[model samples]
Target: SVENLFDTYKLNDTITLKNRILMAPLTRCMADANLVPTDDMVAYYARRAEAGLIISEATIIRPDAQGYPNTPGIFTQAQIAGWRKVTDAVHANGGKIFVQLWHTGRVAHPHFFGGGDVLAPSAQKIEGSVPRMRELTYVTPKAVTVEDIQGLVRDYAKAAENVIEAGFDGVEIHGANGYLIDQFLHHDSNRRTDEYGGTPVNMSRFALEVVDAIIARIGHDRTGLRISPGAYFNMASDSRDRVVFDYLLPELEKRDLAFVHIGIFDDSIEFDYLGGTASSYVRAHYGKTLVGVGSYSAETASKAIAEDKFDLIAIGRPFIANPDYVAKVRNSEELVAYSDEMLASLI
Candidate 1:
């Protein structure tokens, strides 16, 4: 049903082909102790390489950016080298891959920070969103100082280098699902009075800087942004629902971003809080290759594509359950419900 509905749609001449199916980035926390993807992870991704495009799980760009145990990183030499194996596997299997870059920001419990305290746009603490490990308690994140912001810019640039070394065709900046960039971009979570904190432009500075840094390292054509305009994860105390649409969209458009991934539904805690309507905004603006994800079913995705709302559709749970998800939709196969074992296996 979906295939017939979108058989001729194409995202671009390069990134995606005539197929409309895309594998949404999912995090199972299945990496090794050092947060490098293992052979099993490689198998998991390579198994689903049939999609027109694939985005990897949320991966930390720097050590301090981590907020969970066993989540993979793209910054270290070992991590980059390890990711090369995964990318090689995907490319060999005929899949286009984009590495998702992440930073947990205030979500980081000091314990998850590796060495320093968790960083944020300003010195603000959000309730109900501290880190959690087995038998461990949630911890408050220390606000990032102005000096720390400068270092973060460099860290992002260096991490972009690592993504290149990992052999990914492109990079997706994780701005959605209540991570560091989203935390700063969202108003309620950010309380700084300085340039990094008030006003839409001031609040957007950090994210803009990160984008500029990534572009400086990798060029704009290879850069994409993942955003959920209304994501409510981690405590978006007083953030407006239109901030992303009103602010971030114009900036990305002006800067000429390669593509944009908008999560309509997500599994991250922030997704529960901040996930907003993307299809509506995508129809009005975002002239580039637009991907719509987050809890979309075949029917919904097909309709969106047919209506010209999205150039690509990313399937998350569906792809996770059915390795041949594109084929399943094409053949109208009954979908398998997620099992407890699969749920438990989720990292």
Candidate 2:
């Protein structure tokens, strides 16, 4: 029943959401020139405070982490204070929020961050141009050394520290969507034979390092993760990628994160290797809290929850069209259709 969507859920010993609806992270590219959250963004998030949890748009841990223009950063003082305003507004309205930490890896275009080497697990490159900025073609990334891996792991923990200072409820490691973390997870992007690639344990090592570091900085209760087991985004599909995730998911279960979310643009795409959808595959391997996303309507999401498919549901584009999405859905009111033009502004 849709009524179950309104039921309060305990995420961990420290946090309990008022409802099961989460505002999925949607990159709006509305941050200022300095990569700081704008006043518009504060109001934008504050308006949707009814969501049980709000996952802020993918925020770069450092300058080179950006793959798109105006995406917010958490490394600088200005950016931290800017996000503090957004968090303050959300909490004032009785909402909880988590900033999704990101490093875009090979998809990173140096155009936004001066001319620097875009770092990934390996030197391999994805085969496309940047979305919304198609002028710059993708380039070969510098395969990160073991030392670079250590530095990145530490930086991710630092970003988690900043999230707490900004008054966020938690942080979600963006390990999905063929980004830096996902690059290391899949065989297509990670071609190295070092300790960081070429095997399931080696491939999963960097992701766990990032996860453990952030958990050490901020408690595991404040650390959540989103992962893409199926390569539906920038990376090409491979059967070998299945074993890597199969190994990684059980490892994640042992660590006890607040929840693990599936990162698919649309959940309908099924990988032949996984034998089902991403959510189905993850639930089979992972026995803890899970959040499901990918173009689900409130009705379908409720039915999925009824089937015990996932513990929570994250709504993305719908929240953009209806700032009062939680209320509208709860009240069974009509919703405005989302349009591409709506992405031009926060309102």
Candidate 3:
């Protein structure tokens, strides 16, 4: 039966999940003004610690990496201490957790960082203002120099180390959802013709560098990466983009990180370029542990796993609606329908 979803999953020599259900990394924007995770935030995550693995909300790797208000950070001592409480709470409740490392790239806004440069692979700006802060219009990012790119690679490595210091079991590079690493991977945002762009290998260089850097600091088994091969969120698609991903996926398989999770809100959304769903495309290209996400119920997710579509399933909004989601599913109990209003409070 699909009840096998409740069965344990051994990810690697270093980590074994209690179940196949993961709590996806979700942006609640409820951290304190200093961009620190609060006691309330700790309680929020602790409540959902029943998840096999809880990927923390997008936490900025640097000050200028911020794109929204109250999103937590890992670069500061205070921020690390703040997350320590969160990791502690999750562990005390008998759960494994990973911090999602992020850099918004062109999606970044200066206002959030007190007016600093917003950096990306190219100068193109994704037209619009920051969500929840309409006054802060998106600005054209400064095209990063080679030195700047190197600095970013180092910063991501440092953030991975910080995540471990803050008491997390692992780190997930937020290379999805039109963020920094995603921006570089897709042709729509990355227009550079240098060593970091133009060809598929070049486009994949930055993402691989960040991954390699993190793996160098932490063991490969402790690092995971999320990627959006499909151009959906905050991005427009190009026909050539599919080829880029075609080249990149096989390259990533060589590293064998903890797992590669598809970053999408809905897996049913089809892409003509990829011939169908992003999940299917990635599974075909990358032959390793894959985490499938996006709007799946327990039954549906179990079926997908049973079909070997992916090794794990990550739930986002469902976890927010039912903190005891795993227990409910285990007992075959009813689940509360999720609502946007639920975002106002982390219960």
Candidate 4:
């Protein structure tokens, strides 16, 4: 039965999860004007703290990292203090939590950050309006120089330090969903000929640098990473992207991170280059703790875990629809179906 999934999971010597169910990071644009998480955000997380771990929504590392309206930030003192209540509530409810650190890159808009240059690995533009805001068009980004790259690495490490100060158990580097780090990883967006681009080793440089820097600032045992080997969101596909991930996954396996999470909205979609689904490809390559997500029910997640597909499972919309999702599953109760209308309110 699903009881097997209720067993304790030891992520590392530093943190042991109560169960194998993790609350996947879901973006809910509800933070305050200064991009601080509100009291409602804290209550939202605390109500769902029965999960083994809770991964916060993608939080901006700096002001320029914002692409959407009212997403939370971790760089400012007020933002840090705002997150303290969130972390404290989760812990008080007997749950472990991690903050997902983000930088939007080309997906960023000038209107959001008072008109600064949108920095990315290359100058390619995403060519779209901001989600829910049609007036703001995505602009071509300025290609980051070596100095800019160094500053970004430093900022990510600083954000990691800040999240820990805000009382999060750890931090997850948002190296997925065609964001800053994901742009560098894929070939379509990274047209650079420098050390930060071109060959597989070069394209993988920026992500590895951020991972190493965060681990250095925080312990390896307290650092997690989310990656998308498949170019699905906010990205165009490149066949050679497979080689880049292949070369990069082995390097990541050696780092001994808290875990590596597969970042995809669905797992059934197959990539010809990956030879199968994204989660299967990652499971075949990386031998460490892996968190599998994407449109999975408790039964399917348990079956996949039983078959050794991934070490843990992360639930997204399910968590949104049912704050007591873990408890409901434990008691086999019917779950509320999720709808876009539900995003209008936290509960």
Predictions ranked by lDDT, top down? 4, 2, 3, 1
The whole-model C-alpha lDDT of candidate 1 against the native structure comes to 0.75
Cα lDDT for residue 309, candidate 2: 92
Error of 2 at 38 (Å): 0.7
**Cα misplacement distance, residue 198 of candidate 4 (Å):** 0.8
TM-score of each candidate structure, all chains considered together: 0.90, 0.99, 0.98, 0.99
Q: Tell me the lDDT of model 4 at 105.
A: 96
Listed per candidate, the RMSD to the true structure in angstroms reads 3.3, 0.9, 0.9, 0.7
Per-residue lDDT of candidate 2, residues 1-347 (tens digit)? 38999999999999999999999999999999999999999999999999999999999999989899999999999999999999999999999999999999999999998989999988898888988786888899999999999999989999999997888999999999999999999998999999998899999999999999999998999999999999968989999999999999999988999999999877777879899898999999999999999899999999999999999999998999999999899899998988889998777
Give the worst 10-residue stretch by lDDT in candidate 1.
267-276
Point out where model 1 deviates above 4 Å.
4-14, 129-132, 237-241, 266-276, 339-341
Q: Model 4, clash count?
A: 0
- The all-Cα superposition gives candidate 4 an RMSD in Å to the true structure of 0.7
After TM-score superposition, the amount by which residue 199's alpha carbon in candidate 1 deviates from its true location, in angstroms, is 0.7
lDDT of the structure predicted as candidate 4: 0.94
